Amino acid sequence: AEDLSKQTEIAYGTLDSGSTKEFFRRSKIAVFDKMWTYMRSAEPSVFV
Amino acid sequence: AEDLSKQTEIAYGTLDSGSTKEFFRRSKIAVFDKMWTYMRSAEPSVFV
Amino acid sequence: YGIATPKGSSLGTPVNLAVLKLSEQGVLDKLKNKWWYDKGECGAKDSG
Amino acid sequence: VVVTTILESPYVMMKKNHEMLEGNERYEGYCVDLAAEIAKHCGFKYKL
Numbered sequence: 181a182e183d184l185s186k187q188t189e190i191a192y193g194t195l196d197s198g199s200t201k202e203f204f205r206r207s208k209i210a211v212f213d214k215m216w217t218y219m220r221s222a223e224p225s226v227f228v
Numbered sequence: 229a230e231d232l233s234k235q236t237e238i239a240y241g242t243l244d245s246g247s248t249k250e251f252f253r254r255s256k257i258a259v260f261d262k263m264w265t266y267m268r269s270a271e272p273s274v275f276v
Numbered sequence: 277y278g279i280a281t282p283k284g285s286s287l288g289t290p291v292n293l294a295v296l297k298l299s300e301q302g303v304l305d306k307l308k309n310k311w312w313y314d315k316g317e318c319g320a321k322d323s324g
Numbered sequence: 325v326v327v328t329t330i331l332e333s334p335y336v337m338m339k340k341n342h343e344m345l346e347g348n349e350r351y352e353g354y355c356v357d358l359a360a361e362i363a364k365h366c367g368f369k370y371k372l
């Protein structure tokens with residue numbers, strides 16, 4: 181995930197409603213925070 | 229400084245007491261914060 | 277990793293409620309991202 | 325409340341002047357700070 185979060189070539193999506201999306205919402209790890217700032221910043225929507 | 233702060237090959241020192249060292253102390257920019265966490269973490273002392 | 281309470285401890289319930297309250301504020305996570313990463317000065321990038 | 329903690333970085337570490345400081349001030353680390361946020365809320369005196 182450190183190699184995920186440091187490169188924006190790849191897009192990161194999860195389910196529209198589940199335990200995975202909510203896990204990155206209430207997370208506060210810096211790697212996990214920076215992903216959730218990207219997951220919200222989805223043009224188009226990464227979620228499915 | 230972004231190319232400074234992302235590579236620890238080079239050491240960063242300032243004066244022992246002056247307006248430069250205190251500028252990075254009370255700074256809160258993320259690049260400037262990460263330098264001051266390195267300036268404090270000096271083995272041996274970076275300051276002069 | 278969990279807090280070890282002796283069998284029949286008075287601090288079996290309040291510690292477990294303290295587990296939840298630190299998690300709900302993300303304070304467990306904000307300790308983890310802080311201590312591992314300000315110490316992470318040989319970030320694997322530097323040898324690469 | 326006597327708190328048993330094993331001596332292992334980064335969870336429990338030794339302060340720089342570990343002979344100078346004693347008790348709670350001697351010990352730093354993650355489980356140390358984890359004990360402090362619990363004992364603040366659960367109100368018990370902790371000895372490391």
Ligand SMILES: N[C@@H](Cn1oc(=O)[nH]c1=O)C(=O)O
Nearest residue numbers: 194195197198199200201203
């Ligand atoms: N089953 C999971 C939902 N979920 O489905 C996946 O394919 N990943 C994932 O977290 C839940 O209980 O929320």
Ligand SMILES: N[C@@H](Cn1oc(=O)[nH]c1=O)C(=O)O
Nearest residue numbers: 242243245246247248249251
């Ligand atoms: N003159 C400066 C001190 N200073 O000396 C340098 O060579 N850089 C620097 O910030 C001050 O007023 O504190």
